[PDB]
Design a protein around this ligand. Sequence first.
Ligand SMILES: NC(=O)c1ccc[n+]([C@@H]2O[C@H](COP(=O)([O-])OP(=O)(O)OC[C@H]3O[C@@H](n4cnc5c(N)ncnc54)[C@H](O)[C@@H]3O)[C@@H](O)[C@H]2O)c1
Ligand SMILES: NC(=O)c1ccc[n+]([C@@H]2O[C@H](COP(=O)([O-])OP(=O)(O)OC[C@H]3O[C@@H](n4cnc5c(N)ncnc54)[C@H](O)[C@@H]3O)[C@@H](O)[C@H]2O)c1
Ligand SMILES: NCCC[C@H](N)C(=O)O
Ligand SMILES: NCCC[C@H](N)C(=O)O
Lengths: 135, 681, 678, 262
Amino acid sequence: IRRHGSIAKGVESGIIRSGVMYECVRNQIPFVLAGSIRDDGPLPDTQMDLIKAQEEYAKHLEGAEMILMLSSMLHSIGVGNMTPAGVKMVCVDINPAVVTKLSDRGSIESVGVVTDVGLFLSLLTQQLDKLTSPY
Amino acid sequence: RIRFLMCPPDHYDVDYVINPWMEGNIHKSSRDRAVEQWQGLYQILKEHAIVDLVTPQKGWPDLVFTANAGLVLGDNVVLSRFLHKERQGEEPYFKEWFEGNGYTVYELPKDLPFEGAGDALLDREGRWLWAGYGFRSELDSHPYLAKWLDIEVLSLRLIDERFYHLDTCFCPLANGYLLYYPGAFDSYSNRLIEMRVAPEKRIAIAEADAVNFACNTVNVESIVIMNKASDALKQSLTGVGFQVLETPLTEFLKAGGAAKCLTLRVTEPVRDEVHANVYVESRIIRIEGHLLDSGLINRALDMIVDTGGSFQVLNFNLGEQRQSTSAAEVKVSAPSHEVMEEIISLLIDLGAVDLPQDERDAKLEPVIQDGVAPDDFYVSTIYPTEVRINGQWIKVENQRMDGAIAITQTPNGLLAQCKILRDLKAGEQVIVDVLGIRTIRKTESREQRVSSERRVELVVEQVAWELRKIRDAGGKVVVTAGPVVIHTGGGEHLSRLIREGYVQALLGGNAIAVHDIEQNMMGTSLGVDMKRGVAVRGGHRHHLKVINTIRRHGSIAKGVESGIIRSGVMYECVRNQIPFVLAGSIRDDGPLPDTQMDLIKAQEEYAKHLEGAEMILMLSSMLHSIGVGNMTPAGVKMVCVDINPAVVTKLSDRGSIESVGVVTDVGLFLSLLTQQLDKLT
Amino acid sequence: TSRIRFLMCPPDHYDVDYVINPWMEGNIHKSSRDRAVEQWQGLYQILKEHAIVDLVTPQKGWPDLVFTANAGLVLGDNVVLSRFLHKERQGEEPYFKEWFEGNGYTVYELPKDLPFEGAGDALLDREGRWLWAGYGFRSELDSHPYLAKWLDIEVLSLRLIDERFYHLDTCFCPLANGYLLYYPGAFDSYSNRLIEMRVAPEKRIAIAEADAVNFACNTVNVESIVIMNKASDALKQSLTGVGFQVLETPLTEFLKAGGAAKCLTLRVTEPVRDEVHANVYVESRIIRIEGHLLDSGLINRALDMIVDTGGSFQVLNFNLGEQRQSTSAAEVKVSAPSHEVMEEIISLLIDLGAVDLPQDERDAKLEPVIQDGVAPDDFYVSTIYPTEVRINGQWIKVENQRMDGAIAITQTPNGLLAQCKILRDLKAGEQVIVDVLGIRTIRVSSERRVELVVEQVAWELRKIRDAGGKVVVTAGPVVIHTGGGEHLSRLIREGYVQALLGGNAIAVHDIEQNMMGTSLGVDMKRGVAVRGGHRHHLKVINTIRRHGSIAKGVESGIIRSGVMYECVRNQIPFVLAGSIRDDGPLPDTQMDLIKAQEEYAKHLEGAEMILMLSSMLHSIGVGNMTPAGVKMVCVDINPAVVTKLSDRGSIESVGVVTDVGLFLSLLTQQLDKLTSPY
Amino acid sequence: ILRDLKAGEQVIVDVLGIRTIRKTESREQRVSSERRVELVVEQVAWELRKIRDAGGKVVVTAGPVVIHTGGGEHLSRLIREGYVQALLGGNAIAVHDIEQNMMGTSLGVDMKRGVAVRGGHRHHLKVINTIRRHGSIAKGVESGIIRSGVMYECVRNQIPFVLAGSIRDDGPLPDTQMDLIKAQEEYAKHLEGAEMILMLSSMLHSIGVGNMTPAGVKMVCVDINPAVVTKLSDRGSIESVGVVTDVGLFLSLLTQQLDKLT
Ligand SMILES: NC(=O)c1ccc[n+]([C@@H]2O[C@H](COP(=O)([O-])OP(=O)(O)OC[C@H]3O[C@@H](n4cnc5c(N)ncnc54)[C@H](O)[C@@H]3O)[C@@H](O)[C@H]2O)c1
Ligand SMILES: NC(=O)c1ccc[n+]([C@@H]2O[C@H](COP(=O)([O-])OP(=O)(O)OC[C@H]3O[C@@H](n4cnc5c(N)ncnc54)[C@H](O)[C@@H]3O)[C@@H](O)[C@H]2O)c1
Ligand SMILES: NCCC[C@H](N)C(=O)O
Ligand SMILES: NCCC[C@H](N)C(=O)O
């Protein structure tokens, strides 16, 4: 990816053909990769100026009606701190302590579930299918 | 010519239970060893002073505890009003004695408990009064004390029920010395103590001495009298010219009292300067909603008391139906302005409001240094907020938690916007204090809410030994640490390790530094009470205040140099010139100016200090532990402590010969570590 | 009286201007007034083909005036005018009121601040026999007796528990000929039981979530015609199968605000029968509670308890106390939808120190024990707290206090004796306290891993069944607590389980879940509760002991479904091994553990596979008895348990760390997939 | 199994003439703060001495994790010096405590290095066979083969114990009550008058004892699983205190803080 210069060029060149990042690129979903101290590389797309990363996070959080926080303590807290009340928040993690901390804006705003995030996503998509079947 | 008031144990007993020491001891009193122990005190004291006596009375066995009779200064005395009715009958007899010895007697309202010199201790040079509260004396009696004794009153809060009276854990001595037990007081009170009493005059005793009622000491000039003392106590007392005289008082420890409690000095130092000074503040707030069933009113009262204030519910208007709204007016008291601010901030969230005639404009202060808020800036929350500017309520924009509120006059009118600290610009007006702020949350929003210990001791033995060997051999040890080190009490121990040569470099993030500094500067740590071991809900003001302050001084080193940072992990790093790196993170508040937010550079800096390392100590940092791991070649001993068994396993790919791991409490680990290190000399 | 007339209101001033239900969230000003006008005209015009439609004058600033269903409730010449919970709709009331007055109705008005939102929340039985009335989100329970008296009709109360279905007419729809279109998941266990008692199974059309979120229950039924927003064709076939004609007309612009066809209409010509008169099942009891109510938050805890259990309240007075440390006193009128719910509520308030007002004190009710070790029906269940009971106008202390017993009153030389006894100690001829009168107290494996073990285990189970081999299940009560019971009973009914080994607990809770929809008082419809009473639990144990066995409970008809039911009906042998913490126990439970081990061993003979579902004590017991060569499948959320059980290696031990319920859910759905090439 | 053997049967001893016939592939294969904790210990220790001086009644329920974690010696000490008027448990705690004192092992656990071990069954069954031979634990002690540990101290100071059977029991010991109706009656009998109940990693026996125990009884629940500690605290913060740690750790602190009180 570093040789190509970006994730998008990896998609344009044909070497990335499927997956999460692929779909963000092909459907033009904006994404932000915030750097960390343990990053390998990193990818060219990754923002290693964290002042900027926070600002980009904040910009993309404007107008959000809902935030899905999938098994990511460092990033979910980062996002919580930037988010005003009134935004539905869904926190998925296997550690009960993480979910407890993130879920403290109460039932009408904080929904927490302690489960494997993969199983959760599997049930979520299969549930979304069920809502489609009366067409 | 000093006079003490005492009362003979002729009808002494434990008839009932009103403090924890009395538990079980009902009718377990030996009147004769009581009589004889009481004599020992009596006789010793007449060898140094005049002793007057109260006529003992059948049916009031606690009359022997004359320290609670009242509080005497000059010709004035404030009569004790007892909380428990088991002792209220003592009041006429104590009153009779005071009036028969010429004193002007002041009596508190019959609803303000106050329990005498036993709960309120004079500074022996007579400069101020230390009044306690928490269990027996109400906070709201303190301004009556100042008014009537014409003296400066300093409020201390009692948090441990064992030390339910101030004189059981606090004891002013001759020539400015203080015998106190810091663990009976909350963080705000300990801070008050340290700022009035210079460190060389402070005598903090251990828990062992304190449960033998060591603070419950009569001090007559250079003579101190008490029940028992460890010789570690006798050593310090003599070390500044105090002669310690012991005498058994065990039969009275069973009702809850010792030497001090059995006496009341009625000859006290009236000074020169003194005049009435009280720091206690009071405010009436109003709360409206479904108070009884939302548990709204009940959560408000909890925030008030837990933060260190008191309340009086002045009136309740009950709505006519379940869906009718109710209203409550509540008088709030705080021991200082700072604690009142803490309390009003939490209440603003719950939607408490000023009475509409006491509405006032928010207070404003200019920014003068880019990225630094003025002192005492209000800390924003996640909730929708209005502020009052020249008589008008204005909506705050870009609402976010842990920010400040900036006010501007624009071509389009008044603008109130929430800004994080580092975005503030010289010239902006910022809300300080807590007037003219309310929340506009809607109804329903407001109405709602694996490793063995013995295994562990094994590892500690192993690590400790290899850790000294490396220090003697002039080697290099690196530490990576997360905030859980602070939260669990590990801080003092890591301070100690750095101070005594075990740590050549420290690698962490923003949070560990902010939390360590918060804890040393204010005795708190956001999200955690490190004086009782469980989590707490608020704490954001203390946290942002530390961030704003270090940003003001411009670095941690200048915080230390300027003397505002006097202790703890980061302090020791600066004092012993131990290099530290703080690598930024996406979740960082502020950040501190020391924090490296360029992560390419942060990685280069981490690598630079890892060179030559012979051991790496990884203390609950997970993210920084892995980062350091990737950078570290083989041949480097790696010790990984974390409570999550998943990260400890994640960090041990170097086999049982280079990496050792344990799944416990890192504070526990660092205690054992520091103990086992002491046994090695 | 054969001409049908409806009230509606055109959308001239309609938009979503605020949020007062979950549907409006995120939809402020997202209504297309063109599609809204066109969609309302579709419904208006279809309706005029079958009925009379009158119109209210639309009004600026009151967009939800189009939902005339909430205007009020009409029966004959009387209407109860609705009072809205939210002020955003309260300005509608005068316009509705004047429409009703202009059309000659007698208008009854509830007390101010007592919410009731009309036919939207109260639905008449189509033959006019009674009125179904909802509560939980908008209407107050205490509105219901007003409806019964003023409209002169029997009123049945239903508790809504899902905020998406905040009005009865979004999830419940009485139809011609006694049929009922409804969504069970919108209701608590009591309410579902009440629905099933009044409407025969062949008359119930329970719909699926996919239909409910399209507002399929929000249906206008004229005669054999049903009009709605959208129906899946499974729902069309069910409805047309019993003779209804389904008319669809899109109403999505109105779904954005939380309403559809039925919400947009109000029938003002309703069937009035002379033999139909006022009847109330709602009960109320004034209660008194004292202490530091504001500090300890006791008042808050009790009110929350009343509302969680299905009841309501009204604080009649609150006395602060005249000095700072003095106690507070509150008198609270508590109400419940039935006598049964009032007993669960009063039991919880007793446990907390609530007492009767002096003038309301009554003696405890007593019933005799006719069979040793069996209490009479509706015996009071005791707590840990010290307890006094009123016998013959006098209060006496209860001895040997212990939770989960009965209170036996007996005569002795010198005086009356009240003692707490566990059920099995009760003796014939003893009097036992029933009802709640005259009682008071004094102060982890990855997704891919899980999916691969499920594939492997399902293929294994199908294979053993087809070959006529033997599979044994060991299970603990967590299978039921977490929600996995119906998956296990399905395994047992479809032939995958040849023997079940367990304990007293799993049988008690499975039978509790199937008789009363609760497990340890936790309603499965809601997920969890503020804990839950032991009454349901104890009634089960008592009822089975009276019958004499689980099988007799099935023969008698009181156990109709569940794990134990399937074992009995398919003759799957089971063994219930006793333990030190057993309540009761059930008669079926083996309390001689030498024998229990021998029975376990006998049933383990020939086993090719053992499913160990979340049961450490029993799974280890079973492991020790089982030779190598038996496939073993261990499911538990604690990694340590699974590690210990899985030490016969990969070819024999399969372990997965996951919730046993989810596991069973994936297992059954996997077994279905293996069936679909037939 | 041992209890099915009959006088006259021949039984294999030693290890000659035994082989396994496993097939190829079969053979070729294979939340609570520390400081919080020190708080509770301080509280429990103090209330525990107060009750002992006042001649009160303290009951202990204990599971094998007490032995495995090193807690044994400390519980021995508590019983020996008057803090425990009754002991309630199961088969396993007794077998493990006796195994450990008699052979310094404990099935499934190495209590000299703090991690689990794989074998240990011979030592375990040998203890069971031996006590069954003497016919009771008291006669094991009297005959001098049991010289130390929890069950030893119970017998030496005449502290009543109940061992309630379980479906997983090996043996069982002849002392173990396998009639659970009776076992419940026996537990209840010794819980009368109790002023405190100390619940040391027993979960199953802790709940059993809980159901039987009226209010006004102080209940201390130590377990490493945070789920059972929460399960046992329905008596509010004034009657039930709980901690989520190592029970051996707990009992060490407890015994240390008890020493500081003299
Ligand atoms: N190759 C690289 O460059 C690299 C590699 C690793 C991490 N990083 C960076 O380190 C930072 C930390 O990443 P993070 O947010 O994943 O760590 P995190 O500390 O925030 O932990 C994520 C959470 O997932 C939970 N968890 C574990 N298994 C789970 C499961 N099955 N289901 C649900 N939850 C589960 C954990 O309890 C944790 O709270 C990231 O920003 C990351 O990009 C970079
Ligand atoms: N009412 C009664 O009479 C009654 C009540 C309770 C227990 N008992 C008896 O006590 C004995 C102990 O019962 P037990 O076997 O259930 O206890 P157990 O100690 O054996 O624990 C069962 C296991 O389930 C695990 N667990 C918890 N939640 C889980 C989840 N979602 N998914 C998967 N695993 C989960 C636990 O880690 C545990 O290892 C039983 O014999 C029981 O009948 C009787
Ligand atoms: N300061 C000693 C007071 C002791 C007395 N029994 C009391 O509880 O007030
Ligand atoms: N069933 C119609 C009610 C819909 C309306 N918007 C409300 O929230 O009341």
